[PDB]
């Protein structure tokens, strides 16, 4: 088998944003450079509404 | 000792967030631990029960 589990169904996904989803929910299952955490955050704005 | 390995052990072979001991109080045969998520995702009923199950397929039920 190429991979315990699969990265991803092809046939469940429909635009690029379904692809992105679908990596972040199975990212565990991989080796993984960078094992995610809490983010930080060093610029912030927030501009006037209507 | 053993009851911590065991469950890291488990949490490896099923993806599951790891525990890691903060401080412990162990008076008689009483005790009492605070465990640490390690990457500080909330408490979950599952981790609480495959951290109950303790020696789990190694003793009877």
């Known amino acids: 088998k190429l991979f315990e589990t699969s990265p991803f169904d092809p046939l469940t996904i429909k635009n690029n944003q379904d692809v992105v989803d679908k990596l972040y ?3 565990s ?3 993984q450079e960078v094992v995610p955490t809490k983010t930080f955050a ?3 704005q927030f501009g006037v509404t209507s | ?3 911590l390995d065991d469950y890291n052990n488990r949490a490896y072979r099923l ?3 790891k525990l890691e001991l903060v401080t ?3 008076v008689g045969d009483d005790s009492v631990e605070v465990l640490r998520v390690v990457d500080g995702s909330p408490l979950t ?3 609480a029960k495959l951290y109950v199950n303790c020696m789990q397929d190694h003793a009877d039920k």
Request: hydrophobic share 35%.
């Open chain 1, 25 to 27: 929910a199975t990212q």
């Open chain 1, 29 to 31: 299952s991989s080796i």
């Open chain 1, 42 to 44: 060093t610029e912030l």
């Open chain 2, 1 to 3: 000792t053993v009851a």
């Open chain 2, 15 to 17: 993806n599951l967030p």
């Open chain 2, 24 to 26: 412990d109080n162990k």
């Open chain 2, 45 to 47: 009923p599952e981790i």
